Amino acid sequence: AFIILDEVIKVTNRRVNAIEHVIIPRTENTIAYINSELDELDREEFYRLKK
Amino acid sequence: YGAIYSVSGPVVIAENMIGCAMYELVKVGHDNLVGEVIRIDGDKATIQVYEETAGLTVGDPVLRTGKPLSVELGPGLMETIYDGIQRPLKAIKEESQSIYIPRGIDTPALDRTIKWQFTPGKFQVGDHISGGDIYGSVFENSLISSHKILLPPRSRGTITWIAPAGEYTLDEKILEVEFDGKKSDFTLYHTWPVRVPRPVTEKLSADYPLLTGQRVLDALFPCVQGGTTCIPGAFGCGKTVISQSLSKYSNSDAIIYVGCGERGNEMAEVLMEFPELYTEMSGTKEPIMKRTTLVANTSNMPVAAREASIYTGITLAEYFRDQGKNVSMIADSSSRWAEALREISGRLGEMPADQGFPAYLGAKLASFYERAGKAVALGSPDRTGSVSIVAAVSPAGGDFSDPVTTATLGITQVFWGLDKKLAQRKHFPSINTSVSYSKYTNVLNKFYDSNYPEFPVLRDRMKEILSNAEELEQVVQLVGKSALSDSDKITLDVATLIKEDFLQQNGYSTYDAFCPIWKTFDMMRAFISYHDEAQKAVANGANWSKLADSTGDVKHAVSSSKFFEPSRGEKEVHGEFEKLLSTMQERFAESTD
Amino acid sequence: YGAIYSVSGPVVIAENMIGCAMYELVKVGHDNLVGEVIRIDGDKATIQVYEETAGLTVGDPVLRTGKPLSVELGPGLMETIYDGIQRPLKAIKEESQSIYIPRGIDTPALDRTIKWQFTPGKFQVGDHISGGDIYGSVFENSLISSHKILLPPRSRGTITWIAPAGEYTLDEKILEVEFDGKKSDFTLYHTWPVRVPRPVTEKLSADYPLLTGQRVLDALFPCVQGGTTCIPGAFGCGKTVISQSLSKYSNSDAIIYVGCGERGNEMAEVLMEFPELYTEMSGTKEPIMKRTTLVANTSNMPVAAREASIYTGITLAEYFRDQGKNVSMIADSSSRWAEALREISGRLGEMPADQGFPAYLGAKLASFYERAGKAVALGSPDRTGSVSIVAAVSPAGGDFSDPVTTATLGITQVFWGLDKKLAQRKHFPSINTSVSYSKYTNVLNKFYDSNYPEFPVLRDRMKEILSNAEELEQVVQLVGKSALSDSDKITLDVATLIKEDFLQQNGYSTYDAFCPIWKTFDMMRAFISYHDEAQKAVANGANWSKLADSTGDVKHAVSSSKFFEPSRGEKEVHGEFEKLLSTMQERFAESTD
Amino acid sequence: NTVSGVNGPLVILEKVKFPRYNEIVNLTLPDGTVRQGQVLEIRGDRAIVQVFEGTSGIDVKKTTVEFTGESLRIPVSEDMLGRIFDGSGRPIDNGPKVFAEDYLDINGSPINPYARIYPEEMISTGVSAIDTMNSIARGQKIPIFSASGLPHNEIAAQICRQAGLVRPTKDVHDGHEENFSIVFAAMGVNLETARFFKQDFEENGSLERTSLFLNLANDPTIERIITPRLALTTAEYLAYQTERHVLTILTDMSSYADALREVSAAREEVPGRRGYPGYMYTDLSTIYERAGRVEGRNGSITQIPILTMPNDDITHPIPDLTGYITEGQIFVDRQLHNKGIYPPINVLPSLSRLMKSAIGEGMTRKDHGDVSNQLYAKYAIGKDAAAMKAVVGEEALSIEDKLSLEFLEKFEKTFITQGAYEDRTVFESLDQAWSLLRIYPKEMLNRISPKILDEFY
């Protein structure tokens, strides 16, 4: 049981550290990039609509 | 002068433009509503209105005020609440019986119900005068006058007529200037545009060693008069308690409170809570209200008063800096003025930008931080002045990554964070060294270290000790306390006592809202000497329980020394902290042997 | 003609103008600035002036050229540096006293002070002639005639006058065509519009392989002469090193360098480095500069030369392809011409598209990419030619979802990717199997397998190894190195070593940038046989660290083969790969046991 | 005639069509103030020009017009070094006179003296990470890319303050054959930053050889955007007249991009994406077009601009459009500055397109390019090995990841660490970089020649 918990603790810590380390920045950058592209497209549409 | 040609939306168009500039503000119609001509297109002028346009028909008269939209500088400014457009709420409460500005009602920019006594300065008949020179003195309070009567900037001449001493109103004249014949009449109140910066003698770097009344904030970073610093907020997450505690606990000559886009609940609590507080400047005459200037504009007001509120407060702080005194300008926040600029730009017809912000917000954000600063006072006297700008930041687009806080963080040279758990813990402010930085601590530690400072060595070892204890707290929490070094427990124990005694402050007494620099330097030097003596005693062979149990009343006595009076050594030095080094050296020598 | 009534920015309006074609070029004012008539509004024509205006006053006359802007097609184009508007920088350097073309200067697209040697070809007196026939030749290169004298397109008749052998000027007639009487006199140069494609006999499928001298380019995805390729760049791909190595190490007889808004220093570095270099075809007396035609544009240069630089380079590539010689068209870059078209669309005041670019950029890019390609040369001889168009693109806001990159990559059939991780390690260019593809490698694999080794099996095995190593890098990075076998470590290490040695094509000399197909085929076959023998040796019982550490100098010897010169062995085939394959086969038996 | 109206910073006045493009005109107001500007738009019976003084307060029918008849030109002389002036070229900041012996007009280039050869001489700034990883030439430009929260003024003040002591040691190495000059133009900066840069320039001892251009955010954007063209024209005229390599610093780039991006909604032009105009590439390329070799073969112009991002994102038109025009860039990472290494400029995304032409055999070592490329690949391999080793831990760490993380930590803590005034040579940085790069094996190093590897490990 001690070898089983010591064997599972490294996989849990490595999976939590890898997922927590690699999880946030891709969608965190892509959401702001897509929102900035949508806002730039909306401002480019309104600027052409005002003329 | 002009006639109303057409009205479309919230902006009214007035024709008959035969010389009216696009910078002067005028009142359209018989109601005298607030408005300003932002642009002109041919004979018809386009004027933006910051109020309801109900009751305005085609053919109404338009009369200009004869000058741009700015604030008036005169005596009797303390203990009064006005708006950004020179609208006093006290006259509206007396006449209209309301707080908000009503439609079709106009009030004066200066209160004509209170008069002050004007005294002659060092200017005689036929003496030379210039812009910024001290022409006399005007009483602004019942205890001490701080309103210095000076001439307008960018002007000069000879004083042909000087009035005598006595009480007079702001509308009446007291002096006359002769420059190329009959130049004009001079009074107590002067005009100054809010969109134009006040002139000065010469600008310099912020190196004035002035304190703001923050023990943990002054201990973590050296406060200077004339610098630029931004503080993050959450719309009432602890910024109002830090601004009210910083303004009330401050010991400056003047205080500038600017409410641009507040909800209105903190404005009444700051005005009613300001007179109940006790100032630390040797006086009890309503010093919290009389010693500070209150300009509060709520969310139910026009965008011109909220946008021009920071310009009027920065213009009043520039006039107080030009008078020869250091004033602290605390404005919350720039997000309401940045949203009001995009709201006025969308209604006026301006094009959009990135993140929904206008293109003028980048130049106005740099001009707002460049308007305040420490330099030489303008005029023949050459006095020393300073203006500290404290602007709050909040989200206005749906997140904290907007261009206002991003451009304000890059433009500013000092950052002060604010943790929500520390604000919930009754600690104000809850900023840490790992979430804040400042590059102006070299000049403040150079001059304040030049007088009698020890802030540099205790500040660097205190920031490194807090950064080492903050990193050691996660290793002590995750790994445990049965496998770490003994120096990490002494560093975390000294960081917990220094963070509890320094960061823990909510205005419980008069000694907790105003601490001297020598008491904070001796308090940090006692903790640094206790941590260094504990690490040196533990390095030579010793137990942690022998030193912690060996300290005893010294550790609890060192934390309870902030509730007493600071007059222990001569008038401001702590005498108990000086004698603690002998007991710490005797305990360190006894713990080693 | 007309008179300039309004001139604001890069758009000029001239009333009382006749003609006003959409593609007609004319010079307005007395300065003779470069311009083009874009559209017309009523009786006035709106002309877009791309040259710098530094005193061009409104009220002067406008002289229309009466035809579209184009360049001269004849002798004297190689060994010369010109702009996009056909401006000689050599005569403008001494005459104008400046290295760059200044405003308010006139210069033709062909030299009038040089003479060329006329040689009679197969076209004699009495025989019929047509457009595109080789009536003569000019001695330009030591191996073949680069500048061949040809007739203009859309012409026919009989040659009544044949000039003899000797030198002649470009202003004297040496040929006469008789077609219903005296038609006209012919010169050495020929006129052709840049806004119109050159005629041809018929189009054919590209089946001629075009070598570029790159191990990563030819090893990654094979391409033949007459195709289109798009490369998304971020200022890290090394377009200057790929243009100089593609022009010097290329197998084409002509090179067309077009500058679409470069810094100027990269064109001067490749221009000064081109004369000191040695040609691969045994060229002498500046063989790199004599066989290459360079058009140089700047970021602050005129927009007319930047917009007409691709049409002038494609017209020169079509004129050189019509004579029967292979030419390579390198465009750097299409984003500079698309940004100039987007700035012209914003300056014109029309309805633009998303991202600022115009809607005609996709049709102009599809027509420019569709204009190039391999086909039969025009003329009665029916010679074979080819034109390979390689244009790089970059984003305008920091993303790869722009219309220029998507429209250029959508119309093209070859894609050259770019990785920031491989580009960060000094790899110009970084081409992977997931971000690259080419359908012409299968047709080129037959002639490449007939006149060379089996590169098509090594390309599919290298792409299959890189496809498994790409998922193995993310799987080993995400989960860890304790969840994979020893077989994937040899594929990841072999893909990292082959990607590192194959990706780096810049080096620090002339030996790390020019690699033949046999050296890349033997180097890829050595790593493929080493990985295949290491997988079978590790499958029978072995360790990955014992096999990788057991290899030693055998793995570094194959990686160090790129540092050697390409002249070893017989002509291009190095004999070290045969002994390295036998040493890997001998080490494979020792690694198993 | 008279002023028809006013929209934004530009004023639309009605007058005759006698003025030309970029013609200097004067507007007379009824309050006793005169404003000068340049005619940016000329039409029939109307004109659109941007005034350099003020942005509001223009009369409609109470104003007068006066035609100057001269084009806009900046007066440059051989004595501009050692004076203080504003963004409009006026001596009102207590500096020297604005008089000049020569007057040349500007339309994008004074004479168009572009270089026709690659730059061979290398200019050292006094940083082993900056000069070693990016070989700056006499005509090549390399800007500093920073973020909101990093000391860009301390890095630019340290780079400008380093010039004066490393230049005499580099002059003996054949890296420079003439005197060096400095051209400082401030735009959109605070008074503490300009006073700190002037205090560092006066404390360094280069006050008489440098130029002072002060532009604030409270002034007009037309004068702030026109100040870098006059500063680059005066630096190019002084470098062309004196035959000396001048280094120009253009900071901040966000204020110059915000000045041209400010007037985008008060005109008849359609702006591009992100609110900026569609002609921002020509304005950004106009500053880079005045860089390179000068006439005579003894003078050059160096461009070292400071770019501060207003949002902290790498996907922006100012950093991508400004960095795409120049050759390479120097990126400053917040992770390196947060640890304590000074400066925080990392060499991971940094590169130089003209690093091979800047290095030779008389002013630098021949193996500096192989050690710079091997150290650049070992820095990214050590960063990827440290990032994979941080997530993976010590249960699946590779053998090469420990030496790559050790060489990345020793190189980041040894080569990246440097004082604000401590001089360092490229020969000692290459010798220390060879000893720091010697910990790797011979089989791993495959990006260098065998003679350079056998000569030195």
Curated annotation (Swiss-Prot), chain A:
<comment type="subunit">
    <text>V-ATPase is a heteromultimeric enzyme composed of a peripheral catalytic V1 complex (components A to H) attached to an integral membrane V0 proton pore complex (components: a, c, c', c'', d, e, f and VOA1). Interacts with RAV1 and RAV2 components of the RAVE complex, which are essential for the stability and assembly of V-ATPase.</text>
</comment>
<comment type="function">
    <text>Subunit of the V1 complex of vacuolar(H+)-ATPase (V-ATPase), a multisubunit enzyme composed of a peripheral complex (V1) that hydrolyzes ATP and a membrane integral complex (V0) that translocates protons. V-ATPase is responsible for acidifying and maintaining the pH of intracellular compartments.</text>
</comment>
<protein>
    <recommendedName>
        <fullName>V-type proton ATPase subunit D</fullName>
    </recommendedName>
</protein>
<comment type="similarity">
    <text>Belongs to the V-ATPase D subunit family.</text>
</comment>
Curated annotation (Swiss-Prot), chains B, C:
<dbReference type="InterPro" id="IPR000194">
    <property type="entry name" value="ATPase_F1/V1/A1_a/bsu_nucl-bd"/>
</dbReference>
<dbReference type="Pfam" id="PF05204">
    <property type="entry name" value="Hom_end"/>
</dbReference>
<feature type="binding site">
    <location>
        <begin position="233"/>
        <end position="240"/>
    </location>
    <ligand>
        <name>ATP</name>
    </ligand>
</feature>
<dbReference type="InterPro" id="IPR030934">
    <property type="entry name" value="Intein_C"/>
</dbReference>
<dbReference type="InterPro" id="IPR031686">
    <property type="entry name" value="ATP-synth_a_Xtn"/>
</dbReference>
<keyword id="KW-0540">Nuclease</keyword>
<dbReference type="Pfam" id="PF00006">
    <property type="entry name" value="ATP-synt_ab"/>
</dbReference>
<dbReference type="GO" id="GO:0000221">
    <property type="term" value="C:vacuolar proton-transporting V-type ATPase, V1 domain"/>
</dbReference>
<dbReference type="GO" id="GO:0046961">
    <property type="term" value="F:proton-transporting ATPase activity, rotational mechanism"/>
</dbReference>
<keyword id="KW-0067">ATP-binding</keyword>
<dbReference type="InterPro" id="IPR007869">
    <property type="entry name" value="Homing_endonuc_PI-Sce"/>
</dbReference>
<keyword id="KW-0472">Membrane</keyword>
<dbReference type="InterPro" id="IPR020003">
    <property type="entry name" value="ATPase_a/bsu_AS"/>
</dbReference>
<keyword id="KW-0375">Hydrogen ion transport</keyword>
<dbReference type="Pfam" id="PF02874">
    <property type="entry name" value="ATP-synt_ab_N"/>
</dbReference>
From Swiss-Prot, chain D:
<dbReference type="GO" id="GO:0048388">
    <property type="term" value="P:endosomal lumen acidification"/>
</dbReference>
<keyword id="KW-0067">ATP-binding</keyword>
<keyword id="KW-0406">Ion transport</keyword>
<dbReference type="GO" id="GO:1902906">
    <property type="term" value="P:proteasome storage granule assembly"/>
</dbReference>
<dbReference type="InterPro" id="IPR022879">
    <property type="entry name" value="V-ATPase_su_B/beta"/>
</dbReference>
<keyword id="KW-0597">Phosphoprotein</keyword>
<dbReference type="GO" id="GO:0010494">
    <property type="term" value="C:cytoplasmic stress granule"/>
</dbReference>
<keyword id="KW-0813">Transport</keyword>
<dbReference type="GO" id="GO:0000329">
    <property type="term" value="C:fungal-type vacuole membrane"/>
</dbReference>
<protein>
    <recommendedName>
        <fullName>V-type proton ATPase subunit B</fullName>
    </recommendedName>
</protein>
<dbReference type="GO" id="GO:0005524">
    <property type="term" value="F:ATP binding"/>
</dbReference>
<dbReference type="GO" id="GO:0006874">
    <property type="term" value="P:intracellular calcium ion homeostasis"/>
</dbReference>
<dbReference type="InterPro" id="IPR000194">
    <property type="entry name" value="ATPase_F1/V1/A1_a/bsu_nucl-bd"/>
</dbReference>
<dbReference type="Pfam" id="PF02874">
    <property type="entry name" value="ATP-synt_ab_N"/>
</dbReference>
<feature type="modified residue" description="Phosphoserine">
    <location>
        <position position="109"/>
    </location>
</feature>
